């Protein structure tokens, strides 16, 4: 997209993920992680986004907890309108909602709850 | 059709699942195509043809067709090496008998096959085909025909290679006896089977069948349902593990024994 996968967002994504590491937790801080994730959503539309969210999931990118918060908000925003049947695809693709690792966590439980509602 | 064996083979595999039986069948004519006397290329296309024909075979009932093909490939295969000849022929035959088929028709093919196997001189391969016969014959109710062949066979297996077969010849033999209805002989046949069986590890199913037949004697003729139930359970377990239809019949028997004992 114009500045989505060819300027601010993408360049910033590559430098951070190197800084953060997938082999470590927090060395950056969560703020940059959240900011990138909220910006990428704003940057692009529904068809582009789904491919992008899955990519990010490949890499660890901080705490189990940190990632879970970021994924949860994005699910919340996609929950509307015609955007709802494409959402079904995304939530299924990511495993941390049909799967636990640390599952005394409320955010994951909610996202499952929602899937049942669908 | 296509201009190559490779392209045609791939396209054919998908046709049965997508459209229907008729489309995959037309491609199988590689069998009556690119024939030689050398048979370097011709054998390679036959190996592909056996698998494609099996895929087709249950739905079509092409049992009759298969028969023409089985004879037809035979002098071709002999040519390149005896071992492949032996292998394609045996492999096809196993495929054939799985399906619903006429016994008479099958028995002619197996019968010619025995002669084919002598020609080169195989007691390894010949012994195996003779086994298949005892199983086909019993169903047709040529019980008498089964008894003699089995007696001759029991002597051959004993002395020669491969130890495992011997138990099967003994299992088929007791079945022969059961239908004739003279009870002691059958009780005695199974005991022999248990002896051989214990020596090496044998699957649950082989053993389980023996126990159904021990069971047949106990409930239906010695009326000792308590004991018969114990045999049926074991048999029931052996069948469950590898999945067989036999389990439902064993399940009937396990219920019946309780009713006879007079306990709802």
């Amino acid at each position: 997209a114009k500045e989505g996968r060819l300027q601010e967002v993408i360049e910033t994504l590559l430098s951070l993920e190197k800084q953060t590491r997938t082999a470590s937790d927090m060395v950056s801080t969560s703020r940059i992680l959240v900011a990138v994730v909220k910006m990428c959503y704003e940057a692009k539309e529904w068809d582009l986004l789904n491919e992008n969210i899955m990519l990010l999931s490949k890499r660890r990118s901080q705490l189990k907890q940190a990632v879970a918060k970021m994924v949860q908000q994005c699910c919340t925003y996609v929950e509307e309108i015609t955007d709802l049947p494409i959402k079904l695809r995304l939530i299924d693709t990511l495993r941390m909602v049909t799967e636990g690792k640390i599952y005394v966590e409320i955010e994951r439980a909610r996202l499952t709850k929602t899937l049942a509602t669908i | 059709m296509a201009a190559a064996a490779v392209v045609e083979f791939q396209r054919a595999q998908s046709l049965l699942s997508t459209d229907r039986e008729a489309s995959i069948d037309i491609l199988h004519s590689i069998v009556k195509r690119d024939i030689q006397e050398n048979d370097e290329e011709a054998v390679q296309v036959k190996e592909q043809s056996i698998l494609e024909l099996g895929s087709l075979l249950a739905k079509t009932g092409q049992a009759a067709e298969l028969g023409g093909l089985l004879k037809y490939v035979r002098p071709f295969l002999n040519s390149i090496s005896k071992a492949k000849a032996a292998r394609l022929v045996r492999s096809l035959l196993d495929l054939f008998l799985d399906m619903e088929a006429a016994t008479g028709q099958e028995v002619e093919l197996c019968l010619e096959c025995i002669e084919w196997a002598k020609s080169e001189k195989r007691t390894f391969l010949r012994q195996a085909l003779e086994a298949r016969l005892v199983s086909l014959y019993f169903d047709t109710k040529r019980y008498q025909e089964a008894l003699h062949l089995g007696s001759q066979l029991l002597r051959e297996l004993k002395k020669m290679d491969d130890k495992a077969l011997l138990v099967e010849v003994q299992l088929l033999e007791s079945k022969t006896y059961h239908a004739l209805s003279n009870l002691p002989k059958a009780r005695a046949a199974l005991t022999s089977a248990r002896t051989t069986a214990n020596a090496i590890y044998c699957p649950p199913k082989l053993q389980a069948t023996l126990d159904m037949q021990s069971g047949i004697i106990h409930a239906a003729e010695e009326k000792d349902w308590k004991t018969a139930y114990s045999y049926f359970y074991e048999a029931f377990e052996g069948y469950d593990s590898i999945d067989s239809p036999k389990a439902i019949t064993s399940l009937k028997y396990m219920l019946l024994c309780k009713i006879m004992l007079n306990t709802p």
Partner: protein, 41 residues
Amino acid sequence: AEVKGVCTEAGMYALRERRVHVTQEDFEMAVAKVMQKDSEK
């Protein structure tokens, strides 16, 4: 000594079946069990 064993085994099958008197099928079966021990080296 190993003949004695054949007799001891024979009793076990019959007991398990809850029979009063031991028969030829069992007695043979026992011989068979002891014959397998002899077969192995």
